[PDB]
Design an enzyme around this catalytic site. Structure first.
Site, PDB file in Angstrom:
ATOM      1  N   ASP A  35      19.148 -30.503 -43.825  1.00 16.47           N
ATOM      2  CA  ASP A  35      19.763 -31.801 -44.058  1.00 16.47           C
ATOM      3  C   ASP A  35      18.903 -32.648 -44.992  1.00 16.47           C
ATOM      4  OD1 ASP A  35      21.121 -34.159 -43.959  1.00 16.47           O
ATOM      5  OD2 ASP A  35      20.590 -34.626 -41.876  1.00 16.47           O
ATOM      6  N   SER A 198      25.008 -41.180 -60.538  1.00 16.72           N
ATOM      7  CA  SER A 198      25.927 -40.414 -61.367  1.00 16.72           C
ATOM      8  C   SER A 198      26.445 -41.285 -62.502  1.00 16.72           C
ATOM      9  CB  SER A 198      27.088 -39.908 -60.506  1.00 16.72           C
ATOM     10  OG  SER A 198      28.093 -39.290 -61.276  1.00 16.72           O
TER      11      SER A 198
HETATM   12  C1  LIG Z   1      23.159 -42.323 -44.833  1.00 16.07           C
HETATM   13  C2  LIG Z   1      23.792 -41.029 -44.365  1.00 16.07           C
HETATM   14  C3  LIG Z   1      22.765 -39.945 -44.063  1.00 16.07           C
HETATM   15  C4  LIG Z   1      23.371 -38.629 -43.566  1.00 16.07           C
HETATM   16  N1  LIG Z   1      22.308 -37.632 -43.317  1.00 16.07           N
HETATM   17  N2  LIG Z   1      22.825 -36.318 -43.439  1.00 16.07           N
HETATM   18  C5  LIG Z   1      24.121 -38.865 -42.279  1.00 16.07           C
HETATM   19  N3  LIG Z   1      23.537 -39.224 -41.160  1.00 16.07           N
HETATM   20  N4  LIG Z   1      24.527 -39.319 -40.234  1.00 16.07           N
HETATM   21  N5  LIG Z   1      25.675 -39.026 -40.754  1.00 16.07           N
HETATM   22  N6  LIG Z   1      25.443 -38.744 -42.056  1.00 16.07           N
HETATM   23  C6  LIG Z   1      26.562 -38.412 -42.932  1.00 16.07           C
HETATM   24  C7  LIG Z   1      27.714 -39.387 -42.832  1.00 16.07           C
HETATM   25  C8  LIG Z   1      27.524 -40.674 -42.347  1.00 16.07           C
HETATM   26  C9  LIG Z   1      28.587 -41.553 -42.232  1.00 16.07           C
HETATM   27  C10 LIG Z   1      29.852 -41.162 -42.609  1.00 16.07           C
HETATM   28  C11 LIG Z   1      30.054 -39.891 -43.103  1.00 16.07           C
HETATM   29  C12 LIG Z   1      28.994 -39.007 -43.211  1.00 16.07           C
END
Ligand SMILES: CCC[C@@H](NN)c1nnnn1Cc1ccccc1
Length: 329
Positions: A35, A198
């Site tokens: 991640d 982008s």
């Molecule tokens: C600032 C995002 C960080 C991201 N880390 N993988 C994440 N952490 N938790 N979720 N995400 C994705 C997500 C969050 C909100 C809506 C859709 C997808």
């Protein structure tokens, strides 16, 4: 040193990707979600509330001769609404032949329902900047941050597959894995993410719109989240597509053929094929399908998740001034 590991979609929709990781001595192999949007390496464990484990492989620190409890350390993360928390060990962690000793391995005592319900993901391996790590009272470093000085080059690359396996490499750039050239672009680390801008977009065979779109390169997010104007322009090209409040985003007829979506990286262009944007029926047997490009309104940040990243070979350059690189493939 270098490492190279295959990453595999967890399901037929490419909802997430898992990569095998060796932890401890003898090795315990867990399949982790790499991640680039977070900075904790956490695992299901022998400490996780039993009712919250449903098919995952667990780390058992008492069976690792190299595990050491990090005294007093705890962690807690809230992601999309999911969460997890626990205590911390240090142990030997290897990815694709690259070994870090003394890596913080965050052992879950509690996980939220969405983690329990996903039997295929045994934990997360964070690859954002270590300033986002949640361990308290002493913040810990990511796997990449710990490995960096040993690597042949201070980089890792993501080469995610569409409905197919792909690769994470550490310490080198496989020049056979992409076409053309890699275009590098500036990164801001101020929010702890691989945040970049982008240069614009196009929908299908339409003309490219030059416009700055600030967002994060996030392998841990499934979809592509962009400003509402951009997303409306895309879905307007799909007959019958609509934003559904009840479903939670844009949906479209499963009978549609979707247009591609292009995003700019400097003067270069990455083309996401239309089929990458189809996430299948909203519920089993429905003829309404969920879109892979969704509005970021209310997230507060644009997210270049797996839908975008899997169309490219992506370089996470952790040199003194970090940069991102993108190539077609
Ligand atoms: C600032 C995002 C960080 C991201 N880390 N993988 C994440 N952490 N938790 N979720 N995400 C994705 C997500 C969050 C909100 C809506 C859709 C997808």
């Amino acid at each position: 040193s270098t490492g190279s590991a295959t990453t595999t979609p967890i399901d037929s929709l490419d909802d997430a990707y898992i990569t095998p990781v060796q932890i401890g001595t003898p090795a315990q192999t867990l399949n982790l979600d790499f991640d680039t949007g977070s900075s904790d390496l956490w695992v299901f464990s022998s400490e996780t509330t039993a009712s919250e484990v449903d098919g995952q492989t667990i780390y058992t620190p008492s069976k690792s001769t190299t595990a050491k409890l990090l005294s007093g350390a705890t962690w807690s993360i809230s992601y999309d609404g999911s969460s997890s928390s626990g205590d911390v060990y240090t142990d030997t962690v290897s990815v694709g032949g690259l070994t870090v000793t003394g890596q913080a391995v965050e052992s879950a005592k509690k996980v939220s329902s969405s983690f329990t319900e996903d039997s295929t993901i045994d934990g997360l391996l964070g690859l954002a900047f270590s300033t986002l790590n949640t361990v308290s009272p002493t913040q810990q470093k990511t796997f990449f941050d710990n490995a960096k000085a040993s690597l042949d080059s201070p980089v890792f690359t993501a080469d995610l597959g569409y409905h197919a396996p792909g690769t994470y490499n550490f310490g080198f750039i496989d020049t056979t894995a992409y076409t053309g050239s890699i275009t590098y672009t500036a990164v801001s680390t101020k929010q702890g993410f691989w945040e970049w801008t982008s240069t614009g977009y196009a929908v299908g065979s339409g003309t490219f719109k030059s416009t700055s779109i600030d967002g994060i390169a996030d392998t841990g997010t499934t979809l592509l989240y962009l400003p509402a104007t951009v997303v409306s322009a895309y879905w307007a090209q799909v007959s019958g597509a609509k934003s559904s409040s009840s479903v939670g985003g844009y949906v479209f007829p499963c009978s549609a053929t979707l247009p591609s979506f292009t995003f700019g990286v400097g003067s270069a262009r990455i083309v996401i094929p239309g089929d990458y944007i189809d996430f299948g029926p909203i519920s089993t047997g429905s003829s309404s399908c969920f879109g892979g490009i969704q509005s970021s309104a209310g997230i507060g940040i644009n997210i270049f998740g797996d839908v975008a990243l899997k169309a490219a070979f992506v370089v996470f350059n952790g040199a003194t001034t970090p940069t991102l690189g993108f190539a077609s493939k």
